[PDB]
Amino acid sequence: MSGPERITLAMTGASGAQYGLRLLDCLVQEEREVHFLISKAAQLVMATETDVALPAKPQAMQAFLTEYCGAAAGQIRVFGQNDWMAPPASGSSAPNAMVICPCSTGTLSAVATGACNNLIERAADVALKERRPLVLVPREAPFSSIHLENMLKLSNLGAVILPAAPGFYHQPQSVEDLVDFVVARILNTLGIPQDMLPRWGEQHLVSD
Amino acid sequence: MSGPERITLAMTGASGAQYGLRLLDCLVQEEREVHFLISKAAQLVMATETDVALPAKPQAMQAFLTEYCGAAAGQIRVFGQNDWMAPPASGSSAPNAMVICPCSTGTLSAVATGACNNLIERAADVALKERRPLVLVPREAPFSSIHLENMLKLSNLGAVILPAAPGFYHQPQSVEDLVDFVVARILNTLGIPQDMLPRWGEQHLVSD
Amino acid sequence: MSGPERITLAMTGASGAQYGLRLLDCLVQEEREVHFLISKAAQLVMATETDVALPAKPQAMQAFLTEYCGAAAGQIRVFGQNDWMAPPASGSSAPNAMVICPCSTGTLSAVATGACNNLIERAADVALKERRPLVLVPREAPFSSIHLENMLKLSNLGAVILPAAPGFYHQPQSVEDLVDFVVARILNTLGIPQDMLPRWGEQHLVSD
Amino acid sequence: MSGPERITLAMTGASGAQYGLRLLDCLVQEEREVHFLISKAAQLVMATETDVALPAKPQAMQAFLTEYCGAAAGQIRVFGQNDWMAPPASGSSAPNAMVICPCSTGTLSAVATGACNNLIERAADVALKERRPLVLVPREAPFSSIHLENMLKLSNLGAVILPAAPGFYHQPQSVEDLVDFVVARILNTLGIPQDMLPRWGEQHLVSD
Amino acid sequence: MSGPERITLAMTGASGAQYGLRLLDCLVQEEREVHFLISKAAQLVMATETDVALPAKPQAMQAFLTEYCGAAAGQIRVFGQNDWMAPPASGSSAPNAMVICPCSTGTLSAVATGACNNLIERAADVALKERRPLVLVPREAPFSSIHLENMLKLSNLGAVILPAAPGFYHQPQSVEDLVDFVVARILNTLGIPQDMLPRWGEQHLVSD
Amino acid sequence: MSGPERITLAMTGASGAQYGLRLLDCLVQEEREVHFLISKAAQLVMATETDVALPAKPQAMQAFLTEYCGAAAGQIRVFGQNDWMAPPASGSSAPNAMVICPCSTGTLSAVATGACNNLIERAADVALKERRPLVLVPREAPFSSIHLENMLKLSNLGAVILPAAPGFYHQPQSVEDLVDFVVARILNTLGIPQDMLPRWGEQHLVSD
Amino acid sequence: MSGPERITLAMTGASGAQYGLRLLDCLVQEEREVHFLISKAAQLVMATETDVALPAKPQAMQAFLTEYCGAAAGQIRVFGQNDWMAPPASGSSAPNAMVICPCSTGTLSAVATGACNNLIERAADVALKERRPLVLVPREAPFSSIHLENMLKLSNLGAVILPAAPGFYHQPQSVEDLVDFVVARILNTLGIPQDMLPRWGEQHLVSD
Amino acid sequence: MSGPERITLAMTGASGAQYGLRLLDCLVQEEREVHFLISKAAQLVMATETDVALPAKPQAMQAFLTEYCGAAAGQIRVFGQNDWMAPPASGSSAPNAMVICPCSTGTLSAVATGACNNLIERAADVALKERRPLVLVPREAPFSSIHLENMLKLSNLGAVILPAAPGFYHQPQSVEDLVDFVVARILNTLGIPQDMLPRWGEQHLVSD
Numbered sequence A, B, C, D, E, F, G, H: 001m002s003g004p005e006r007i008t009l010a011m012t013g014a015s016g017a018q019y020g021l022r023l024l025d026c027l028v029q030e031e032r033e034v035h036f037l038i039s040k041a042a043q044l045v046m047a048t049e050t051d052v053a054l055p056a057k058p059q060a061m062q063a064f065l066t067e068y069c070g071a072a073a074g075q076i077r078v079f080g081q082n083d084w085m086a087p088p089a090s091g092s093s094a095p096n097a098m099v100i101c102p103c104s105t106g107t108l109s110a111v112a113t114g115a116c117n118n119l120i121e122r123a124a125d126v127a128l129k130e131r132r133p134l135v136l137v138p139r140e141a142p143f144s145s146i147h148l149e150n151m152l153k154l155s156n157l158g159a160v161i162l163p164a165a166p167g168f169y170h171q172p173q174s175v176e177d178l179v180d181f182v183v184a185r186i187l188n189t190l191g192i193p194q195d196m197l198p199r200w201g202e203q204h205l206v207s208d
């Protein structure tokens, strides 16, 4: 298996719920175990931007996402925002890679400062202290200096700052193609195979 | 007239030629004078990502863009990359707002360090020294610390760092809707009217 | 009209509820639209320091403030602390100036770090990213280095740090004169006319 | 009396509830007044790590701790997390020394940034601004750079960063001996007598 | 005696002469020796803001203040701005606490940079080098980054930055109540008893 | 084999000789090759805190530790403090992970500044330059800003700062349980299997 | 008793052995307990600059200094450079103030970086972590930026940097008067009475 | 001639007038042209610490110093504190080395910040901009962080910070020997011959 067996996927309240849902689908299809976390604000983004009717409480949410993605029983493990007995809360847990997608400016802030006010924030704090992968996918424009400083500090500490800034160099034809671009780069960063975005120049041998 | 009469629009070699072409169209439709600059790499992005067959040399390029956008004679003024007798090269010029869209990581770097190696870079240098508007629209993912530090320095100095990171909170249905999101925010930042992206919450009076 | 048409006025839990209430009154009298936000702690400051019996919930609060200030229907628009569909939550909103008066040390902190944990904090974050006015009115003594660093960062980024530190150079005769001093400086900073605090030296022509 | 008459003892959600309970016992035995604060997460640490069945609400908690420690009526004063009318919330209060034991990484963060989101955080903010003692007892491993920067900033500002890192140089024979080591150093830092940890080398007169 | 026997009280040219006069009165009433210093600009503030007719020269000023405050002969010791043979000019002097109230932005600057251009500035320089108390009471709004950086540097070095920012949480009824608030906090910072501002929450035992 | 084949284990003169001895035992049991280094001060810690009678000179020490741990001939390789012909002295050596356990404040300092005054310090210097694992286990309380800055610099450069700060969340019953906690985290950081500390939450599937 | 009961007096290898010997004499005369430490280089300074024939080994040195100063048995306690069982090596010791007089540039460096290579350096490290007094008396000219940065860092952390830079404002008539000036300032900094250097301006009441 | 032909010698108001007078004497004896500057505070130091009755005004002062030092007519050139037509005020002047001896903390500050408030300060500013020698001889103890930062900045910019901290390694027998030590180091720094302080170790050939 290339890449991590387990991914902590946290959705926070930036625009771009579709990115997180598509990533979840792809992780499931790649037979990975996903520890899924979602903020209250992200639930309201999802309701605003999609037709997904996500149940609010963890057990119902787990059953719903398992069906939605065609996952195996136990493959998607949902934890609530104060569930400190979940694996991501401790560095003594089995190792996971972590992705926050989308990453609100507020969660970016919390991670940069070490606020640890809920399980998402603590999970990121743990990832950093244990030197386990941490990928943040912010969606904001403009970025202020506040945002930039927070991203810089985290990138300097080894987090991957991967803005939801899709490329156009494969002539996207739909919204889904642009969503898939970002998801592909997340997967590439994690070392998980993907066939949505070709390997640039792989079959280019010499310059024209 | 709300907003600037003149905009220096520079296209550099990041993905997202469509953003710059759409912005040009909208500026023309808003009856603004555009001083248009394009890098060699941006010409190759445009050829790769679009069906626009842009002529290489400034005079031909000017005639072509005037036709393409339905602009008035003289409305789009194209300057070459070493044309120091063009207005954007001096702070003694009539004031323009400047947008670099898309903004490559290399142009971001040049602007941050003050390299002034061509007219785009010098134009940005001038904007900063004269405290005239400067908006950079980078398209990259991940952002490294190199990128982030350069963006931070410029944001601290009053440039607007506006990543090509479209929002989804108006349920986009096409690639064009996502392009129009970013273009709308550029226009909003410049103070130019636009009717592509509603004013959020304008008719919300009290909380539920 | 000189100055902004719309002001987001946030009250947070520092001492000096009278400053925020007086500012609200003056904004109403100047025919401005006010997007009014108040924290839970500020509600307890107001109950402790004033005889104003402010209702807790936004709709009731809106009706009460409209009566209290003699505002027009629709002139004061109250939003709750999680109301992300309110204008101040997005930079795609119509532009407002923002004042946090009083500004607790905790809200100062949140704004400086980018915490965005409620609508007040997100609104400030938006103001900074969009380069729209942001005035913070802290009331604390002593200021620690924590406070000072947070104020410095924000002032460097263009926020106005306007401490509730009234002057005595017009021989104030009451508490209200000292309240009006601070409110006058807030109005001056926003570019809104006021006749509470004279223009110093306006009719001085030469030195003695 | 050597040392402070009053100690604000805050327990937050790091591992090591035993340290805070032992410190409380020792402070009581030294006839000090304790203003006791505990976070929601710390209540769940205490339930997980000890057999102490602490009641949730302040009045019940006060009665329970008074009995548990053999304190005098009024000696332990419990305040809830939003009780701004408690002494620690204002610098106009009678002076107390403050100890956060254990200190979670999240509370460390809040104190470093000035978040003031509850009474513990505000109490620490007050201690710093008034230059009153503040001792933080973090329990984490590894420490990331996030943690380290926060500790460094606070130590530079005069807080004592006292990690729950017991020494072995008095040949500890039980868990309690290691708990007592840390508690002894806290007491020493506060200037409160203790006879758990000898004064190193006190009766050494010259080198061998 | 709690607190310092001797206080160097310097008045500089910020608004708020009443704060310095009230502090002087309270120090006298607490039987402290005061080494009183006043800048030329502060003399013009006092004449503008009060009805106190302070004589210009030190001997006359000393006699006048002694009468005004009901001080003992020798209790108030006035030194001129170039009087290097006064105690505050040398760290070999008997120890004093020092308060600059009000503290102009210019004196704040001088202290931060070490300018030592007159006895007030040198006295502060001495306080810092000898690690003797130094309290600055600035009165300005807005604070620029210039002001903030200067205050930050000094707070980091152990000075107390105590802005003339009175609280309202004891329902002040007059200007004098607001003056007394600030003076009370100065006295509290110095460790001198005062009965103008109650000890917050002293008789609160448990949360509601 | 998961984790490194070879570990350079350096013991320096902080309290907590038991941690280093237990780690050595566990590494031996996991069939790893250990390049063992010990400072003069650490030898005096070991004699003070344990009943282990460690011989002073490398050959005798090697024979003694081999017996003590039940190691294979050649499995523990002891090098003296000036033995520059030992593998850890050069980056051209076969790769090892390095652990300094316990890590004195003086060795922390030396590593942070690059002092390279003995083989332990040079070995760490090499680890950093070659980007090979380096784990420091300090035992000190309080940590001063000196200590914190040194730890911060090293953590920023990729070293793991793992304080000897055991957790209590598995209800330790002896000193050995607390020693084993820290050793388990060291092993986890190195990627070496251990069964002393469970994987937190591994069999938790959804929130309560 | 004003000032500390115990002083750790370390002599290191800067010029000015007379300062350290005079300080020792004065501390003895003030009935203080002195924990005396001396570096190898300082022994060679003392032999070069004075006629004091100090024995090399701690026991002999203790007997010699006791006689030389007319101290009580037990009043001067000499510890060798590796004597970790001496009080100054641990923060669990009874509190002492510490003076390094003279302070070589190398010891200044060691203290600033936290090197802890001998008992003097460790003792200083302990003083800083425990927030106990630490006074360094460097003697060097010029000071390089290396020296200055080290002094700055330590002064920022609360150490007193007291250069052997005697004043002339009491018209010194001998070398001993200049030695006594510096010793007097050390004593003043520690809060120990001295009658060598008058209190400047004590009997000055008003300006001329 | 080794060393500069012309020296700007400024005396400012630190203790140690004897150092500046002795330096002046030695410069005269070495046949150098001296541009002599003295502050008002330095005149009061000189009157306090010496029996030199220096006239206040430049012409009288010039005649007096010429006699006092046995200088040639024209050799000592005195300029007043506002004499901008003197050579040291412009970098277009013939080059001089500059020494400020003694250097008050206030003049140190002015030089570090660039205040240029009188001819001494402007002269130093000029020296720095022209990269001409600048030696500052401060006399203060303790040095605060204010002082240290100012000295550090200037040393980093190439000024020589030469504290009036005499050495004892040539067994000084009088105050004059200690004065001559500092003066000798100033002369050495300037490259002017002196025979007061031997060249250390010049006739040492090998180690003992």
Ligand SMILES: CC(C)=CCN1c2cc(C)c(C)cc2N(C[C@H](O)[C@H](O)[C@H](O)COP(=O)(O)O)c2[nH]c(=O)[nH]c(=O)c21
Residues within 6 Å of the ligand: A011, A012, A013, A014, A015, A016, A039, A040, A041, A042, A044, A045, A048, A103, A104, A105, A106, A107, A139, A140, B167, B169, B200, C084, C085, C089, C090, C116, C117, C118, C122
């Ligand atoms: C159109 C509005 C109001 C903003 C665009 N977008 C967004 C869309 C929708 C539809 C909602 C509701 C909210 C957002 N926000 C704001 C955000 O959720 C909040 O600041 C919030 O406190 C974040 O908390 P968490 O970190 O999730 O715990 C948010 N935050 C952000 O960083 N980027 C975004 O794109 C947006």
Ligand SMILES: CC(C)=CCN1c2cc(C)c(C)cc2N(C[C@H](O)[C@H](O)[C@H](O)COP(=O)(O)O)c2[nH]c(=O)[nH]c(=O)c21
Residues within 6 Å of the ligand: A167, A169, A200, B011, B012, B013, B014, B015, B016, B039, B040, B041, B042, B044, B045, B048, B103, B104, B105, B106, B107, B139, B140
């Ligand atoms: C798929 C590749 C090779 C990259 C995606 N994209 C891009 C697409 C295409 C199709 C081409 C050709 C080039 C890019 N680049 C690279 C970029 O043009 C260069 O670094 C270049 O030096 C920039 O110079 P200028 O600043 O314009 O003068 C570039 N640079 C950047 O910052 N962002 C991008 O999205 C991309």
Ligand SMILES: CC(C)=CCN1c2cc(C)c(C)cc2N(C[C@H](O)[C@H](O)[C@H](O)COP(=O)(O)O)c2[nH]c(=O)[nH]c(=O)c21
Residues within 6 Å of the ligand: C011, C012, C013, C014, C015, C016, C039, C040, C041, C042, C044, C045, C048, C103, C104, C105, C106, C107, C139, C140, D084, D085, D089, D090, D116, D117, D118, D122, E167, E169, E200
């Ligand atoms: C006399 C006390 C307890 C303090 C004076 N004053 C104040 C008065 C009253 C009467 C109450 C109740 C609270 C305060 N506080 C504390 C403050 O509200 C809190 O830190 C709180 O978390 C702020 O949260 P928000 O930012 O509003 O969400 C507060 N905070 C602050 O920055 N400045 C103040 O003046 C005071």
Ligand SMILES: CC(C)=CCN1c2cc(C)c(C)cc2N(C[C@H](O)[C@H](O)[C@H](O)COP(=O)(O)O)c2[nH]c(=O)[nH]c(=O)c21
Residues within 6 Å of the ligand: A084, A085, A089, A090, A116, A117, A118, A122, D011, D012, D013, D014, D015, D016, D039, D040, D041, D042, D044, D045, D048, D103, D104, D105, D106, D107, D139, D140, F167, F169, F200
């Ligand atoms: C075994 C786990 C999940 C961690 C070890 N330990 C701990 C034990 C237990 C059993 C629980 C439940 C929680 C922790 N935590 C996490 C911590 O409580 C939270 O981040 C929390 O948000 C802190 O909030 P507060 O600052 O108290 O308001 C925590 N935080 C920390 O800084 N150090 C710790 O030792 C641990």
Ligand SMILES: CC(C)=CCN1c2cc(C)c(C)cc2N(C[C@H](O)[C@H](O)[C@H](O)COP(=O)(O)O)c2[nH]c(=O)[nH]c(=O)c21
Residues within 6 Å of the ligand: C167, C169, C200, E011, E012, E013, E014, E015, E016, E039, E040, E041, E042, E044, E045, E048, E103, E104, E105, E106, E107, E139, E140
């Ligand atoms: C209404 C005006 C002109 C300002 C309000 N106020 C003030 C009132 C009055 C009535 C006078 C005359 C002067 C002030 N100033 C300016 C200040 O005195 C000067 O900058 C001055 O150089 C200070 O020198 P010092 O530090 O005292 O030596 C001053 N400076 C300051 O920091 N805060 C103030 O409140 C004011």
Ligand SMILES: CC(C)=CCN1c2cc(C)c(C)cc2N(C[C@H](O)[C@H](O)[C@H](O)COP(=O)(O)O)c2[nH]c(=O)[nH]c(=O)c21
Residues within 6 Å of the ligand: D167, D169, D200, F011, F012, F013, F014, F015, F016, F039, F040, F041, F042, F044, F045, F048, F103, F104, F105, F106, F107, F139, F140, G084, G085, G089, G090, G116, G117, G118, G122
């Ligand atoms: C109870 C005393 C004197 C201190 C507790 N402990 C300790 C215990 C014992 C019993 C001895 C003997 C020494 C220590 N030290 C001091 C330390 O060994 C020294 O600073 C030394 O120079 C370190 O050199 P190395 O880096 O090993 O080369 C030391 N240093 C440290 O960082 N942490 C400790 O816990 C302690």
Ligand SMILES: CC(C)=CCN1c2cc(C)c(C)cc2N(C[C@H](O)[C@H](O)[C@H](O)COP(=O)(O)O)c2[nH]c(=O)[nH]c(=O)c21
Residues within 6 Å of the ligand: G011, G012, G013, G014, G015, G016, G039, G040, G041, G042, G044, G045, G048, G103, G104, G105, G106, G107, G139, G140, H167, H169, H200
């Ligand atoms: C005339 C010489 C060679 C220098 C003047 N003086 C001095 C005098 C004598 C006569 C000796 C022998 C040595 C010095 N030194 C150098 C110093 O001792 C060393 O750098 C040494 O390593 C210091 O180690 P420690 O910190 O004591 O462990 C030294 N160091 C210093 O900082 N200031 C001094 O004044 C002098």
Ligand SMILES: CC(C)=CCN1c2cc(C)c(C)cc2N(C[C@H](O)[C@H](O)[C@H](O)COP(=O)(O)O)c2[nH]c(=O)[nH]c(=O)c21
Residues within 6 Å of the ligand: E084, E085, E089, E090, E116, E117, E118, E122, G167, G169, G200, H011, H012, H013, H014, H015, H016, H039, H040, H041, H042, H044, H045, H048, H103, H104, H105, H106, H107, H139, H140
């Ligand atoms: C015993 C006193 C009051 C101090 C010791 N000494 C000194 C002695 C005498 C006897 C006088 C009168 C003054 C000083 N001072 C203070 C100093 O002159 C002033 O700060 C002054 O503003 C300096 O201005 P300039 O830079 O010369 O323009 C001063 N300043 C300084 O940096 N170092 C000193 O040694 C002393």
Ligand code: NA
Residues within 6 Å of the ligand: A115, A116, A117, D106, D107, D110
């Ligand atoms: Na928290």
Ligand code: NA
Residues within 6 Å of the ligand: B115, B116, B117
């Ligand atoms: Na160039």
Ligand code: NA
Residues within 6 Å of the ligand: A106, A107, A110, C115, C116, C117
């Ligand atoms: Na948040």
Ligand code: NA
Residues within 6 Å of the ligand: C106, C107, C110, D115, D116, D117
């Ligand atoms: Na808050």
Ligand code: NA
Residues within 6 Å of the ligand: E115, E116, E117, H106, H107, H110
């Ligand atoms: Na001056």
Ligand code: NA
Residues within 6 Å of the ligand: F115, F116, F117
């Ligand atoms: Na070395």
Ligand code: NA
Residues within 6 Å of the ligand: F106, F107, F110, G115, G116, G117
């Ligand atoms: Na060492």
Ligand code: NA
Residues within 6 Å of the ligand: H115, H116, H117
């Ligand atoms: Na000037």
